[PDB]
Design a protein around this ligand. Structure first.
Ligand code: A1L7D
Ligand code: A1L7D
Ligand code: CO
Ligand code: CO
Lengths: 378, 378
């Protein structure tokens, strides 16, 4: 029961629909996410389906859908510029919606920059209606009115030409749905971007335990989490801030060439098995010193919260914990998805805790910085 | 014993040194080739090594070395333009040489466009001297004078930050060395490109059984194979030609945006195990109708050549055969390494046959076209 602001007169954002990436080699990118991250290739458009300008590979893990897109032709102006500016990265964060027309009319009236006005596509399995507007940077939002669409992903997509015996042979990673999608902004842009979500989409600010305590000194960022009225989609917005060390938000914006998605968090209900199986697929994660766990166990000595998972196993797998007196979450961060120090992924499991892990900024900073100081900062 | 032309006064091309690819996401490209194609990540340069403009991932399988390169910074003019024009593709075909200075002086005198004049790099393990010239398209040749260099690949490269438990868990693919590297040229360019190899590098034309019989009607190409004096490096040069169907060389040049490497052939001494294990890693290859093998077995009835490998297994794995009365080769072609219909790979094993498989143009055309004609060309 919190201040959610005025209830929108019409329109609903049900959930994240899919995330679309603009990449240099969609075939190889799909292979990376299926083999390393537990996805399965679901659907495809390309030369073989009559799509002559764009190749599209759709991969799925439970409710999580990622789409990888590349150009077929030399000197594709739009995709080419994006690739050169940003490297591989997120282009579209798509939302499943009800009452598309109200949402789009309101967004347009309130100043949204339109990429494509309402359109529909159909095949043997039904019809889907869409619209696309710009958000921060070169990122966009497609609203997807799927009317319990019974086809393969979306109209026009076809089965992949081949099955993949490599991805098939690997163990399940148990990632269920997209928990949140974080967008990094350049200096001083967080408030105007958050205001866009409030005005254009009638989102509101989501207040969690992380908003109640300052972590700027360690995190070197400020964040505002924007969410739809029913709080089913969460869009954190970061900007750099003055802290004890150079801001990773500034590094992101420098190497991404502007604002963009920093991380996508994937919610799991069995993080130990998830991380064991992601590690078996060759994924790497932040290295966590043993002192983090020694200090965490000492802090937990005065807490009434009960950690259900085996702490020795969490320590072995370098899974992080954040808690208050009413619950806790588990989280872990992958290494970067590319050479540029830009996008990474997060795996998160919640036990009655609606925050984002901000306590770990201080906890990891203290454990890692102290050890490096002892090592002469060499 | 054939006409090799005049023997060069100084200089030797020993072998292929490595192939460098300019790609959108070198981290993910290295992962594709290690997991799908049997390579292992060997060495690295990037932010962690002091390389602030370029990330470089080096992967190796026996003598075969592939290097994947991406830019770190937005709007890298050279790498960006290459990426937008071509997609992911080969940038540099590097040769290991002796007497670098003669080779470079001669190439420069004879009109080579220089990318970088002779330079040297050194670390704790020794020194290597290099030079780079342009060849066809945006492709270049680096000459590598490695003086039995005892370090990790080349000076300045470091160990990868992580080992990869995915690539480690997969079965060996038995690819030994680069057999040949084929370059597709636009209409009418084959002769001038072949003449460049003869004049600038003192290569000569390699004549094989494939040059003695015409296959243009089926292959829709013309080829000249250029080779160094000792015939240790083979560089086929293709151009489109008029045949029964649209030329795959024309499709390549259209989607690559000009000349470039069409395929890299990797030599194996156990093709059955190689293909079994590449298939277990999720690689796909051209589908071959059973009629190809029925017709091949009937043609072999009048030949004195003895196929050592089990033909039923070759048929199961869709491995191709080409032969004359003095020997045979086995070969197979992967599907494309990217969405654009440009680069693919070949696995080849030779049994006393120095050709390139040109007999399979007709054999596969006849088997595939006949079946499609029966299927109404739908
Ligand atoms: C809305 N919101 N707020 C936080 C989040 C996170 O995912 C999130 C939460 C905690 C951490 C990180 C990300 C992270 O990268 N590190 C490492 C680090 C980076 C700089 C300085 C000190 C430590 C953390 O400790 C989110 O989604
Ligand atoms: C120097 N040199 N000459 C040939 C080569 C090859 O690798 C090579 C040899 C045989 C074939 C292919 C490549 C190939 O793609 N197909 C399929 C096909 C393509 C168009 C029309 C009919 C059939 C073949 O049958 C090379 O390296
Ligand atoms: Co997060
Ligand atoms: Co070949």
């Amino acid at each position: 029961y919190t201040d959610k602001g005025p209830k929108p007169d019409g329109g609903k954002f049900l959930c994240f629909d899919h995330i679309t990436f603009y990449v240099g080699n969609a075939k190889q990118a799909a292979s990376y996410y299926t083999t390393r991250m537990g996805f399965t290739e679901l659907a495809y458009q390309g030369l073989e389906t009559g799509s002559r300008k764009l190749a599209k590979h759709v991969v799925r893990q439970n409710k999580i859908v990622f789409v990888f897109v590349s150009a077929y032709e030399p000197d594709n102006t739009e995709l080419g510029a994006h690739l050169v500016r940003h490297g591989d990265g997120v282009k579209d964060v798509a939302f499943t919606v009800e009452d598309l027309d109200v949402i789009v009319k309101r967004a347009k009236q309130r100043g949204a920059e339109v990429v494509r006005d309402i359109w529909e596509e159909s095949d043997e399995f039904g019809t889907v209606r869409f619209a696309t507007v710009k958000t921060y940077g070169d990122t966009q939002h497609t609203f997807v009115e799927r009317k319990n669409y019974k086809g393969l992903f979306l109209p026009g997509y076809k089965a992949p030409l081949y099955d993949d015996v490599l991805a098939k042979q690997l163990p399940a990673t148990h990632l269920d749905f997209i928990d949140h999608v974080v967008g990094n902004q350049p200096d001083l842009q967080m408030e105007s971007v958050a205001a866009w979500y409030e005005k254009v989409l009638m989102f509101h600010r989501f207040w969690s335990v992380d908003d109640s305590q300052i972590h700027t000194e360690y995190s070197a960022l400020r964040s505002i989490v924007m969410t739809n009225y029913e709080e089913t989609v969460k869009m954190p917005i970061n900007e750099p801030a003055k802290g004890k060390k150079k801001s990773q938000i500034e590094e992101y914006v420098d190497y991404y060439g502007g604002a963009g998605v920093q991380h996508i968090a994937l919610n799991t209900s069995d993080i130990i098995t998830a991380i064991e199986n992601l590690r078996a697929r060759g994924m790497h994660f932040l290295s966590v010193p043993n002192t983090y766990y020694d200090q965490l166990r000492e802090r937990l000595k005065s807490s009434k919260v009960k950690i259900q998972e085996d702490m020795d196993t969490l320590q072995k797998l370098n899974i992080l914990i954040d808690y208050d007196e009413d619950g806790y979450l588990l989280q872990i961060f992958t290494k970067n998805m590319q050479d540029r120090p830009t996008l990474f992924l997060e795996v998160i499991q919640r036990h009655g805790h609606n925050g984002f892990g901000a306590g770990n900024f201080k906890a990891l900073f203290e454990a890692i910085e102290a050890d490096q100081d002892k090592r002469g900062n060499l």
